[PDB]
């Protein structure tokens, strides 16, 4: 069990090791623990009033506090140590990483929860790269920070549960970059290259959090309709209307949480968009449909790590 230091930070330099190791973003006790810990943080940051599980109704003390301390760092437990794949060609799975490094603690991890897009991530670089599952076509896509991609959401200020989110940045060419880097990724897989490769929403009959883009702003859960943002960047607007909810479905466990009604003021958040959660269905044509898998956020944040034992 990895010791989870809070906030640290960033005196945790690393060293090259003359070894070959197998790395995996998914089958990985660092990321597997990250997901559990983020789920635990999710229920304490924004505090739920009631939780509905199949069998029971849990009522606890809620309020409108909101922990904005969204960043944490892991360090190895006694008799273990952290290795990391420092190869730039890493795509979430590599049985022979030769560029191995070692550190005392991990990088900063962003604990925020969202669907479709990941926000305020670490791991943004001057390249789009793609973590891709060993088995299966689950993927999380890092975006290139060259294109100054942010999201900026507000509720005025008027109607208590309505909100907009503007997608500022060079999305036009950031989005064609991710399409293009998929086209020459070691799993193309069936692809024409551009034009006949497209972004797609999941079905509307999916859960709200799947069908809409789920996120939160100032402790309030927003659900937005992405059809205008998808019309822009395929075929028409660089903003979207999102509506706030109190009953929400839990991402990690099967249940619903009910929260207090929204804040009274003008809400507004400034967020850097750093990843697409998606599944690639390659056409021999291909579609990349957005996902609400969420846990995969944390697999980008720490998927290049590996906890090894020293006996």
């Amino acid at each position: 069990p990895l010791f989870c230091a809070t906030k640290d930070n960033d005196d945790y330099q690393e060293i090259a090791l003359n070894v070959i190791e197998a790395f995996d973003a998914w089958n990985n006790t660092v990321t597997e623990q990250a997901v559990e810990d983020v789920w635990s943080l999710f229920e304490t940051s924004i505090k739920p009033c009631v939780k509905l599980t199949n069998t029971s109704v849990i009522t606890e003390s809620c309020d409108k506090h909101y922990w904005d301390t969204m960043r944490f760092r892991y360090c190895a437990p006694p008799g273990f140590a952290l290795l990391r794949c420092n190869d730039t060609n890493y795509s979430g799975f590599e049985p022979n990483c030769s560029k191995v490094v070692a550190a005392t603690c991990t990088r900063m991890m962003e604990t925020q929860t969202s669907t479709w897009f990941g926000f305020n991530g670490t791991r943004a670089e001057n390249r789009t790269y793609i973590y891709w599952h060993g088995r299966d076509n689950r993927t999380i896509i890092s975006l290139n920070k060259f294109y100054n991609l942010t999201v900026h959401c507000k509720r005025p200020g008027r109607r208590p549960r309505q909100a907009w989110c503007w997608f500022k940045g060079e999305w036009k060419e950031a989005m064609k970059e991710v399409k293009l880097t998929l086209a020459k990724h070691p799993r193309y897989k069936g692809t024409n290259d551009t034009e006949k490769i497209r972004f797609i929403a999941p079905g509307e009959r999916s859960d709200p959090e799947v069908a809409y883009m789920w996120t939160n702003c100032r402790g309030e859960f927003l659900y937005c309709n992405m059809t205008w943002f998808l019309n822009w960047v395929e075929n028409q607007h660089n903003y979207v209307p999102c509506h706030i909810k109190q009953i929400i479905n839990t991402w990690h466990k099967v249940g619903k949480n009910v929260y207090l009604p929204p804040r009274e003021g003008q809400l507004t958040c400034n967020s850097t968009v750093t990843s697409i959660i998606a599944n690639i269905d390659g056409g021999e044509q291909t579609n990349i449909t957005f996902s609400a898998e969420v846990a995969e956020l944390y697999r980008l944040e720490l998927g290049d790590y590996k906890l090894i034992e020293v006996t």
Partner: protein, 150 residues
């Protein structure tokens, strides 16, 4: 595997998987169009006709079982449905038919040419095709029983 159900009934198409790590299952039809699957504890639903009728017991996901439930069946809901987790994939053929009413008619899926056969409590077999106590329709190994009134 084949399952056959009566029109307007529900059927639970079973799919099961033995991985300790947390996974994404998918259900689709012969045409490879998605009806449903999971992403974490959320349920995702593709643009198929089934949706509304299509669902899964989510409470069973945590221990490997990923059923596809269709409620209120319709003859054209008959298909070969495929459950995939990653690289493995179970298939299940569904075939649904009911009995109208006495000239009895048996509406079935196109492709299947069934035969109904009805037997009274002491009286005996009246066997036919589509048109015609306990009426049994025959396809693959098993059939599905029905009803009569006087």
């Amino acid at each position: 595997k084949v399952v056959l159900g009566k029109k307007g009934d529900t059927v639970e198409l079973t799919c099961t998987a033995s991985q300790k790590k947390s996974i994404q299952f998918h259900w689709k039809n012969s045409n490879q169009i998605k009806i449903l699957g999971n992403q974490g504890s959320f349920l995702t639903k593709g643009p198929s006709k089934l949706n509304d009728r299509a669902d899964s017991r989510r409470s069973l996901w945590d221990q490997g079982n990923f059923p596809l439930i269709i409620k209120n069946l319709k003859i054209e809901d008959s298909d070969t449905y495929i459950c995939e987790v990653e690289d493995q994939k179970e298939e299940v053929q569904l075939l649904v038919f009911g009995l109208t009413a006495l000239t009895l008619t048996l509406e079935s899926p196109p492709g299947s040419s069934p035969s109904v056969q009805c037997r009274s409590p002491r009286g005996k077999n009246i066997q036919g095709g589509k048109t015609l106590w306990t009426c049994t329709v025959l396809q693959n190994q098993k059939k599905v029983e029905f009803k009569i009134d006087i």
